[PDB]
Structure 1
Amino acid sequence: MQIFVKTLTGKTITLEVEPSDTIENVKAKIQDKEGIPPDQQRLIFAGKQLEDGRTLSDYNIQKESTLHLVLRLRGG
């Protein structure tokens, strides 16, 4: 299955994931594609924040869904 992730710059990155994958593993896939560290990412869908310990199937993530990505650059 494929899911889309939109960044603040408007670029959409597509990844290949399974519904049983946790959000931390998906953040590691974002680190492999875009090079961002998982210690600086925040994923958003349906007006809620995706916890790192929750799986994609736990958040009712469907196929061909577009999740937003926001970052923590200036810490504090």
Structure 2
Amino acid sequence: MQIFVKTLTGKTITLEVEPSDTIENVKAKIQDKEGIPPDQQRLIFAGKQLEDGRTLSDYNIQKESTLHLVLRLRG
């Protein structure tokens, strides 16, 4: 299945994922596509920051769902 990740300027990243993929896997795929390492990534769905160890289905993220990407800064 396909989902989308959007930056805050509305730039979009298209991903191929499975419901059993962890949020961490999704971050790895974002790194694969954009060079942004997982530790610098926060993903948000329905206003909620998503935890690395949980799956997409845990958050009811289904096909064509849109996630939001923001940076994690040091400190």
| TM range, smaller chain | over 0.9
Q: How does 1:1-76 map to 2 (within 5 A)?
A: 1-73=1-73, 76=75
> Which stretch has the larger CA shift, 51-60 or 64-73?
64-73
Distance in 2 (CA, whole Å) between partners of 1:52 and 1:17 is: 15
Shift, 1:10, TM fit: 1.9
| Structure 2 counterpart SS, 1:58 | helix
Distance in 2 (CA, whole Å) between partners of 1:20 and 1:50 is: 14
Gaps of 5+ in 2: none
Size of the alignment, in residue pairs? Answer: 75
Name segments (4+ residues, structure 1) moved above 2 Å. none
Shift, 1:35, TM fit: 0.5
Q: Deviations over 1:15-38 (max 9, x none)?
A: 100000001111000000010011
Distance in 2 (CA, whole Å) between partners of 1:34 and 1:9 is: 15
TM-score by length of 2: 0.92
Distance in 1 (CA, whole Å) between partners of 2:20 and 2:72 is: 26
**RMSD (Å) for aligned C-alpha atoms:** 1.1
TM-score by length of 1: 0.91
Residue identity over aligned pairs, in percent, reads 100
Shift, 1:9, TM fit: 2.9
| Structure 2 counterpart SS, 1:42 | strand
